[PDB]
């Protein structure tokens, strides 16, 4: 089948193991160890296509090294998730881009901005302002929640979809 290398990066808390377990497993995961980075595989039919979905659920250290870099530039398409109710995860995003684009040599990668916990009442980032960034950078801005699963199914499956126009481009 196809495979997709997808990666889920953004800052600590945000939802990032509780998105792709949700994905996976279709079930909500409170307190996931949030030390613990594993790549999680699915197949699944996308647009018709056989799509074997492999996911990095990214964590650990914050580390800058030759090797850490060439495994982040092979993911084919990235996740940038922040938390709707967490201003500085969504100001963080711009660095997490910058790091993509650095190991990835290229400004054009596939990537989507993924405003997450979109269940939560005591929102602090407005929809607007995560849809006009996302649009300066030229990609899909979807809001998630993990916990009710809210447009996750969406979210993941855009990303293939960016990866997908890429290859042909
Ligand atoms: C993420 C990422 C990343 C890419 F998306 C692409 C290429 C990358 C190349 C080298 C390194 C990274 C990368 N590594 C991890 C990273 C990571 N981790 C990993 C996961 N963490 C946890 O799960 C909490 C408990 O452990 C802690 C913080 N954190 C950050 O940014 C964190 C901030 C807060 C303090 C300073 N630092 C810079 C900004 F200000 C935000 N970047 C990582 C990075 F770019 C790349
Ligand atoms: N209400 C709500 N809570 C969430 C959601 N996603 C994650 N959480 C909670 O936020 C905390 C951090 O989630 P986690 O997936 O471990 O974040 P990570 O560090 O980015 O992997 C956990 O307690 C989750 O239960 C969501 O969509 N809605
Ligand atoms: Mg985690």
């Given at each position: 089948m196809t495979e997709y290398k997808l990666v889920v990066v953004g800052a600590?808390?945000?939802?990032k193991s509780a998105l792709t377990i949700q994905l996976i497993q279709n079930h909500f995961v409170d307190e996931?160890?949030?030390t613990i980075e594993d790549s999680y595989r699915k197949q699944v039919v996308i647009d018709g296509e056989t799509c074997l979905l492999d996911i990095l659920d990214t964590a650990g250290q914050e580390e800058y090294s030759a090797m850490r870099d060439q495994y982040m530039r092979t993911g084919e398409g990235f996740l940038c998730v922040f938390a709707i109710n967490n201003t500085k995860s969504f100001e963080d995003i711009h660095h997490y881009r910058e790091q993509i684009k650095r190991v990835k040599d290229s400004e054009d990668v596939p990537m989507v901005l993924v405003g997450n916990?979109?269940?939560?009442?005591?929102?602090?980032?407005?929809t607007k302002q995560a849809q006009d960034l996302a649009r300066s950078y030229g990609i899909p801005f979807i809001e998630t929640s993990?916990?009710?699963?809210?447009r996750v199914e969406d979210a993941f499956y855009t990303l293939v979809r960016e990866i997908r126009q890429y290859r042909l481009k």
């Open positions: 600590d808390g945000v939802g996931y160890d949030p916990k979109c269940d939560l009442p005591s929102r602090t980032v407005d993990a916990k009710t699963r809210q």
